[PDB]
Design a binder for these strands. Structure first.
Ligand SMILES: [Cs+]
Ligand SMILES: [Mg+2]
Length: 407
DNA sequence: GAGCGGTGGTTGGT
DNA sequence: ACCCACCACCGCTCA
């Protein structure tokens, strides 16, 4: 669920992470904060094959991507109300990211962080998060189009734009379409009533009128239900396309308790949100010797090769992350810039081509582990890094480069 | 989760 | 007793 929702609210805007991240960093003068439901991995991560722990491995590579976007993730886990939590939590930590346990459903807790200002956006499996208070929700972190390769884009959904848009659906309206047409907890709903007639009741306000009703008031329900049931068997207001005389409404319906599960979901306590306001983001500091230990054991990246490869794979990410904390000791991170580009894979975010020493940047020496065309972690390597990030961490190397081009 | 073609049911009109 | 378009529901397919 919700089956067929995107025909009503639109498919979302397909934008890249880079652009969302650098735009935010430009307007708000600090990195984008993202609550990531941990359910997105389950059925996207188990397609890698070979080696040791391919599921954990793609998680590893996506975390290195999150570093290179300069994004501050908080990773959210379902509570009591394939990829292993323990592992995963340990790797979230080695990367200097944050792991958060929801009291109840992760989707609900995410939306709640966003609406409390702990994060600026939710990245989820779908837009269920909108029924839960979400305003800016992402889905489908994935390669762009048929270009089969790097996962660079997400699909962005904007609750305020949807509610104003052709479908008019808002949080209270969708919730009504979930009750009748089916959701996670009540996959049935009103039998025989699907998305098209449910969206027609939502734009007739029936979703507002019910989310405003307490469950105690029993008198108010019947007036609402009898009213709704009457427009259904008659279509007196023209609320719908046709008339549904045989569309049976169950006695239980509406199930307020299931309704309340959306309108007042089990989310963290106020004290938890307070703790979060002060502890997130934390000191984003990647544990280098920790990742080394992890990768040797988890991925069988053993001895010098493994060390080399961990250096190559993590150095561009560590450069971005170092830039956003930070005579000319800018050189400790960047040796030079060679070129500029506004590539479509970032919706044309300006990038500069930075030269750097991988092994020096990471801090590992491969000669201190056993030795058993090639990549030399002491030669310069070259990454494309967003300009806006370079001007914050290495301002004078950008200026020098900028003067070189004028000349 | 989401798309897609099929199937069977409801409505309004032939 | 038929069509007709629309819809809702099913089963499969890809992750
Ligand atoms: Cs239904
Ligand atoms: Mg869901």
């Amino acid at each position: 669920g919700i089956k067929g929702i995107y025909k009503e609210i639109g498919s979302g805007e397909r934008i890249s992470l880079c652009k969302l991240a650098i735009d935010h960093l430009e307007q708000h003068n600090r990195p984008l904060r993202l609550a990531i439901d941990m359910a997105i991995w389950q059925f996207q991560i188990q397609a890698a094959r070979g080696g040791s722990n391919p599921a954990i491995r793609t998680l590893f590579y996506r975390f290195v991507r999150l570093l290179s976007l300069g994004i501050h993730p908080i990773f959210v886990f379902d509570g009591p109300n394939g990829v292993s939590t323990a592992m995963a939590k340990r790797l979230i930590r080695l990367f200097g990211f944050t792991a958060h346990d929801a009291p109840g459903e992760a989707e609900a807790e995410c939306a709640y962080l966003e609406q409390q200002g702990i994060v600026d956006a939710v990245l989820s499996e779908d837009v269920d998060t909108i029924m839960f208070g979400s305003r800016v929700t992402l889905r489908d972190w994935s390669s762009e189009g048929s270009k089969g390769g790097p996962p660079t884009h997400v699909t962005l959904h904007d609750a305020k734009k949807i509610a104003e848009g052709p479908s008019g659906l808002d949080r209270e309206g969708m919730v009504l379409v979930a009750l009748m047409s089916g959701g996670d907890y009540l996959p049935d709903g009103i039998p025989g009533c699907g998305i098209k007639v449910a969206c027609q009741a939502a734009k007739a306000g029936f979703g507002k009128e019910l989310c405003r009703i307490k469950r105690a008031d029993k008198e108010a329900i019947t007036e609402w239900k009898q009213r709704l049931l009457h427009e259904l068997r008659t279509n007196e207001s023209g609320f719908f396309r046709t008339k549904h005389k045989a569309l049976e409404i169950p006695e239980n319906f509406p199930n307020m308790e299931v309704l309340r599960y959306y309108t007042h979901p089990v989310v963290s306590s106020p004290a938890t949100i307070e703790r979060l306001r002060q502890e997130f983001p934390p000191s984003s500091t990647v544990d280098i010797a920790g990742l080394r230990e992890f990768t040797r054991e988890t991925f069988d990246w053993t001895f010098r090769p493994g060390a080399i490869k961990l250096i190559k794979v993590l150095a561009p990410g560590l450069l971005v992350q170092r830039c956003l904390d930070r005579k000319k000791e800018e050189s400790t991170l960047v040796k030079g810039i060679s070129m500029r580009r506004e590539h479509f894979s970032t919706d044309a975010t300006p990038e500069l081509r930075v030269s750097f020493i991988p092994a020096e940047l990471v801090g590992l020496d491969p000669g201190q582990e056993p030795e058993v065309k090639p990549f030399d972690p002491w030669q310069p390597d070259l990454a494309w890094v967003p300009e806006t990030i370079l001007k914050l961490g290495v301002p004078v190397t950008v200026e020098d480069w900028e003067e070189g081009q004028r000349s």
